[PDB]
Amino acid sequence: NADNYKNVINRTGAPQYMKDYDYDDHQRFNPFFDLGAWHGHLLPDGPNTMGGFPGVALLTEEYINFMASNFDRLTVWQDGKKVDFTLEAYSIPGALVQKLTAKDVQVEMTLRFATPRTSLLETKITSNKPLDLVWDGELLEKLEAKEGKPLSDKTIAGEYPDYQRKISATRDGLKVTFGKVRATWDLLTSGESEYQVHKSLPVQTEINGNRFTSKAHINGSTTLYTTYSHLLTAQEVSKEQMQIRDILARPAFYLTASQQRWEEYLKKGLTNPDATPEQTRVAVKAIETLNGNWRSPGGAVKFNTVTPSVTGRWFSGNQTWPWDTWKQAFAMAHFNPDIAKENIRAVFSWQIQPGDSVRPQDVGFVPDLIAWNLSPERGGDGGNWNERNTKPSLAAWSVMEVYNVTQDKTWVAEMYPKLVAYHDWWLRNRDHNGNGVPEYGATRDKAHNTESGEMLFTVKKGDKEETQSGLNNYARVVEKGQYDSLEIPAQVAASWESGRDDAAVFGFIDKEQLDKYVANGGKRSDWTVKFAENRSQDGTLLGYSLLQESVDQASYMYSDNHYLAEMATILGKPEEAKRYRQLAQQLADYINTCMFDPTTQFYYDVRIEDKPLANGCAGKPIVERGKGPEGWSPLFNGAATQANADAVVKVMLDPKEFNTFVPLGTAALTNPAFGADIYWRGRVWVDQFWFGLKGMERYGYRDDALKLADTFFRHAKGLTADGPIQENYNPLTGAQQGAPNFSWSAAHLYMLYNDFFRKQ
Ligand SMILES: OC[C@H]1O[C@@H](O)[C@@H](O)[C@@H](O)[C@@H]1O
Ligand SMILES: OC[C@H]1O[C@@H](O)[C@@H](O)[C@@H](O)[C@@H]1O
Ligand SMILES: OC[C@H]1O[C@@H](O)[C@@H](O)[C@@H](O)[C@@H]1O
Ligand SMILES: [Ca+2]
Ligand SMILES: [Mg+2]
């Protein structure tokens, strides 16, 4: 089945820079990674690279960095004359292949992964005479380029003088060793990491600085085996040696293991018989993408996980976020459930427990960003690890989807208490006014407050800066408005917690836009989101909240409660189930009563106003900041009444609102802060699009959802081409932006294949 899907993504490339970046600093080629391994490979792009898989991509703890263009590239010689080949090269799901054809010699090379640190190359040589084989390779020297043009003349060795890369010959191949580099934002190594090449035949080797040439003589047709391993610690190096020996002893077993695992992914995943071949190919692209973004355990993360993009500037290594994970695992349940489970385990593995050394006031909290390296507060030197905030909680939904597929009650029993703890954390630490309806917010953190618990902020006016602390001081500063900007690190983190960090509803609007808003009769203060601290009965600072309750977050919590009730029932906990059903109903009541505006027929966030309203609502719906995808969150999550759903669907289908060339973007055309190229104020994301179609379907509008899915399929640029999957789309033009090989887009493209794509 895999052979039906050749070159789904363009995996060719010959990188010339460690950082061979696209316009947005992502690696501009798409290497093949599998089994959660920490290195990847490209296909040759022509004569200069044929005979090898160029562009060895090393995952250096938290970043993707190219090591070499040609490395272990084969050329073949007969009587001192080089054999001239023509090349066929292609990817399939789970392998890279190249075939070299000449009259009297042919070579077929197949590359698959064998372990979480090792790939296996089969070099099948057909020849009716003896041959001399030569392999060559060279480490990269240049540091950085953007769209193929150098950003500077900086060198790798110049930039990282301790990297001290060295090639050494071994008793069966060679190794590259690497010195310790703790470049927090760029390159992280232990000083014990190596890239190892082991082969099934003796070779002779000449090393010339950062290049090598190795040779062997064969008698005729033969199949050789080569392992390539990126090993990140001394312990990994030592442990891999027995695995390498086993692979070279029984290579057929490892090739077959990979073949069968991939056949299973495709068999389990490709289950929509109404899909066209073109739609099926998108599903396969999604599967390849998600599986490539899977990382095996590394560093502080003791579980397999999935990152948002192995090629991403800030998304690589094993950097893992919660709401990415929920979406990833929801889709991966349907083809790679073992890793869907692991990915969820990885996020919960650093959930805060009672007596935590850093934040004992945050029991149940799930960190925003976990990674190989712990932060200095937890004894590491990692700069990415983030506990300033979490992400929106679709955890129970994700866990339940794995259960729906596997029917494994032990999985529900494993996750239930972790889900309960998280649920409880939101209600303690993200409910400023104690009404059971959450806010996005931020933790107590070194970045957010002084050691005495006073909130930090920086008031900027022209080129003058003033850093102050204290919520009372913050209050006065907001009242007077004598600043160009007010930077509050806790409120930045709150925007991160929402997942949509420049959304209109959180106060973000450009100058020209706000000027027009004012000219039309609005006030600038309508865009000010106020901020508050959350304290326990005994006065302990628990964190912070926006003085605003978000309709998406309420709706996700509604679903959390619903899924927790379902799980409690499965686990024979009827009284817990009854309590969660009550909490769900109370949230649905608040969502419908408080967040639905009948005049504009849509749902919105509400402010937490100085005094609550007579109906118990914390404030009025924030209609004046315009409509966004949060307004269909009550439909997706099932909190909406039918009547309110009917109203929202009419708005979604309106070409003046959201029914655009690519429909269901992150702000309606009528939103005062709309911009077609703005990430969270117009651009279409696949998650929010699929949430909208699912919401439509839930309330009896599957036919209209199918139509929108067809519009998406026809208009989203690049969908049926061989480019990597990105983050979002211009709603007017369909043009793509964002990191290549983006996981949750893959996840929701797969779900669209499952749920809505079909032959017309
Ligand atoms: O060893 C096979 C071939 O290797 C090449 O690199 C050259 O050294 C050739 O002269 C030789 O015939
Ligand atoms: O774009 C990546 C950034 O995304 C935000 O939502 C947070 O998770 C940050 O910690 C992270 O650096
Ligand atoms: O993909 C990882 C994270 O990247 C950030 O830039 C935001 O888009 C977050 O919503 C997301 O969770
Ligand atoms: Ca509240
Ligand atoms: Mg921190």
DSSP 45-66: -STTTTTS---EEEE-SSSEEE
User: Is the distance from the beta carbon of residue 78 to the nearest atom of ligand 1 less than 6 Å?
Assistant: no
| Residue 487 burial (C-beta neighbours within 10 Å; 0-12, 13-18, 19+) | middle
User: Is the distance from the beta carbon of residue 323 to the nearest atom of ligand 3 less than 6 Å?
Assistant: yes
Nearest-CA residue for ligand 3 atom 9 is 499
Ligand 2 centroid–CA 78 distance in Å is 56
User: Is the distance from the beta carbon of residue 218 to the nearest atom of ligand 1 less than 6 Å?
Assistant: no
Looking up tokens 């695995």 gives: 243
Residue numbers belonging to the annotated binding site = 431, 433, 435, 437, 439, 549
User: Is the distance from the beta carbon of residue 499 to the nearest atom of ligand 3 less than 6 Å?
Assistant: yes
Q: Please give the Cα distance from 463 to 79 (Å, whole number).
A: 73
Interacting residues of 392 by C-beta distance below 8 A, sequence separation 6+ = 323, 440, 497, 498, 499, 552, 553, 556
- HSE-CB at 213 with a 13 A cutoff on CA atoms is 7
Under DSSP, is residue 2 helix (H, G, I), strand (E, B) or coil? helix
User: By the 8 A CB rule, do 622 and 597 touch?
Assistant: no
Q: How many CB atoms lie within 10 A of CB 188?
A: 27
Q: Residue 247: which H helix or E strand, with range? A: helix 234-249
User: Is the distance from the beta carbon of residue 687 to the nearest atom of ligand 3 less than 6 Å?
Assistant: no
Looking up tokens 């064998």 gives: 114
Q: Please give the Cα distance from 326 to 158 (Å, whole number).
A: 41
Comparing CA positions, the residue from 748, 684, 665 lying closest to residue 289 is 748
- Mapping DSSP onto H, E and C, the string for 725-754 reads CCCEECCCCCCEECCCCCHHHHHHHHHHHH
The region that residue 581 occupies, defined by phi over 0 for left and psi between -120 and 50 for alpha, beta otherwise, is: alpha
| Alpha-carbon distance values, 656 to 598, 634, 663, 670 (Å) | 18, 21, 11, 7
Q: Please give the Cα distance from 375 to 558 (Å, whole number).
A: 33
End-to-end CA distance of the chain: give it in Å, rounded.
Answer: 25
Q: Residue 264: which H helix or E strand, with range? A: helix 251-269
Angle between helices 702-715 and 686-698 (to 10 degrees): 160
Nearest-CA residue for ligand 1 atom 4 is 134
Q: Which of 132, 211, 213 to mutate to test the pocket of ligand 1 (most atoms within 8 A of CB)?
A: 132
Residue numbers belonging to the annotated binding site for Ca(2+) = 431, 433, 435, 437, 439, 549
Rg from Cα positions in the chain: 27
Q: Please give the Cα distance from 305 to 315 (Å, whole number).
A: 12
Buried residues in 351-373 as b, exposed as e (16+ CB within 10 A): bbeeeeeebebbbbbbbbbbbbb
Q: Residue 261: which H helix or E strand, with range? A: helix 251-269
Looking up tokens 């190596």 gives: 194
Q: What is the dihedral of CA 308, 311, 315, 319, to 10 degrees?
A: 90
Note every long-range contact of 408-411, with CB atoms under 8 Å and residues 24 or more positions apart, other chains counting.
Answer: 409/570, 409/571, 411/341
Looking from the CA of residue 368, the nearest atom of ligand 2 is: 8
Identity at 308, one-letter amino acid code:
P
Nearest-CA residue for ligand 1 atom 9 is 80
Q: Please give the Cα distance from 302 to 321 (Å, whole number).
A: 15
Breaks (C-N over 2.5 A) in the chain follow: none
User: By the 8 A CB rule, do 250 and 227 touch?
Assistant: no
Q: Which residues surround ligand 4, an ion (CB under 5 A)?
A: 431, 433, 435, 437
User: Is the distance from the beta carbon of residue 322 to the nearest atom of ligand 3 less than 6 Å?
Assistant: no
Q: Please give the Cα distance from 262 to 335 (Å, whole number).
A: 10
The residues with which 211 forms a beta bridge, in sequence order, are: 138, 208
Looking from the CA of residue 81, the nearest atom of ligand 1 is: 12
Ligand 5 centroid–CA 425 distance in Å is 19
DSSP letter assigned to residue 190 = -
Q: Please give the Cα distance from 456 to 454 (Å, whole number).
A: 6
CA 125 to chain centre: 40
Question: Among all residues, which ones are annotated catalytic?
Answer: 501, 727
The residues with which 596 forms a beta bridge, in sequence order, are: 603
Looking from the CA of residue 501, the nearest atom of ligand 2 is: 6
Q: Please give the Cα distance from 370 to 358 (Å, whole number).
A: 15
708: its two tokens: 């929108």
Strands 142-146 and 17-21: parallel
Ligand 2 centroid–CA 496 distance in Å is 6
716: its two tokens: 């989203």
| DSSP secondary structure of 551-589 | HHHHHHHHHHHHHHHHHHHHTT-HHHHHHHHHHHHHHHH
Under DSSP, is residue 134 helix (H, G, I), strand (E, B) or coil? strand
Phi, psi of 236 (to 5 degrees): -60, -45
Ligand 2 centroid–CA 385 distance in Å is 10
Looking from the CA of residue 132, the nearest atom of ligand 1 is: 2
Mind listing the domains of the chain with CATH numbers?
1-232 (2.70.98.50), 233-271 (1.10.287.100), 272-456+489-760 (1.50.10.10), 457-488 (3.30.1390.40)
Strands 485-487 and 187-188: unpaired
Q: Which of 325, 373, 496, 502 to mutate to test the pocket of ligand 2 (most atoms within 8 A of CB)?
A: 496
Q: Please give the Cα distance from 458 to 460 (Å, whole number).
A: 6
Buried residues in 193-226 as b, exposed as e (16+ CB within 10 A): bbbbbbbbeebebeeeebebbbeeebeeeeebbb
Q: What is the dihedral of CA 441, 449, 487, 504, to 10 degrees?
A: 0
User: Is the distance from the beta carbon of residue 90 to the nearest atom of ligand 2 less than 6 Å?
Assistant: no
399: its two tokens: 């866990």
Under DSSP, is residue 465 helix (H, G, I), strand (E, B) or coil? strand
User: Is the distance from the beta carbon of residue 495 to the nearest atom of ligand 2 less than 6 Å?
Assistant: no
User: Is the distance from the beta carbon of residue 80 to the nearest atom of ligand 1 less than 6 Å?
Assistant: yes
Buried residues in 411-426 as b, exposed as e (16+ CB within 10 A): bbeebbebbbbbbebb
User: By the 8 A CB rule, do 584 and 562 touch?
Assistant: yes
DSSP letter assigned to residue 269 = H
Q: Residue 212: which H helix or E strand, with range? A: strand 211-218
Closest ligand to Cα 217? 1
